[PDB]
Design a protein around this ligand. Structure first.
Ligand SMILES: CC(C)(C)NC(=O)[C@@H]1CN(Cc2cccnc2)CCN1C[C@@H](O)C[C@@H](Cc1ccccc1)C(=O)N[C@H]1c2ccccc2C[C@H]1O
Ligand SMILES: [Cl-]
Ligand SMILES: [Cl-]
Lengths: 99, 99
């Protein structure tokens, strides 16, 4: 689809068997989801936002369906105020910014 | 252009006669620039992201060029970690996300 930017570009995702709303975020290097369980091993990470850093758990090789499009990649889980689809997964669904 | 997301979507902007690097950020509601001088009066604003909030100075009706495209709109100034072009100006220049 073509998504305009008049409002936040929120879409439905499926991750870990769960449906969530998430933001398509070209400024985000990484994908960051609110607290949930994911399978496999994880390691801690600190990631930096405009207001400082938060501690997250990093899970690799996680499948996500983003507005109907499947992708696999690293997903960070922690106390993010909104669920964020970052560039590591936007690339996989073929998302571009156009003007 | 059509900008892919394999790398950060950094572009050159022009504000106050000077060239700066800035991030095209669909996840940002507003545009916020590192400390610089802008004309006129400012209003207070708090902006929140990952990690919490920062206090910024809001300047309205500022002339700004984004990757060659002319805009006139609200620019926030404050201790942002990187210069960010958000949706208020991305809409002005006609930007969309496409996949
Ligand atoms: C991986 C992670 C998510 C941590 N990345 C970011 O937060 C980066 C940080 N850099 C910076 C960085 C920090 C440390 C190291 N390298 C880089 C600047 C750009 N952000 C990306 C932003 O798009 C993230 C959004 C998230 C958000 C959206 C809505 C509500 C809450 C949080 C963001 O912070 N957006 C906010 C935002 C942004 C600008 C202006 C106004 C507003 C309000 C709000 O829309
Ligand atoms: Cl990845
Ligand atoms: Cl591509």
């Amino acid at each position: 689809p073509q998504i305009t930017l008049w409002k936040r570009p929120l879409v439905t995702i499926k991750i870990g068997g769960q449906l969530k709303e998430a933001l398509l975020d070209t400024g985000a290097d990484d994908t960051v989801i609110e607290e949930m369980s994911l399978p496999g091993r994880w390691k801690p990470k600190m990631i930096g936002g405009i207001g400082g850093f938060i501690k997250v758990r990093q899970y690799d090789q996680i499948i996500i369906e983003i507005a109907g499009h499947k992708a696999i990649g690293t997903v960070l889980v922690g106390p993010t105020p909104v669920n964020i689809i970052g560039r590591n997964l936007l690339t996989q669904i073929g998302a571009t910014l156009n003007f």
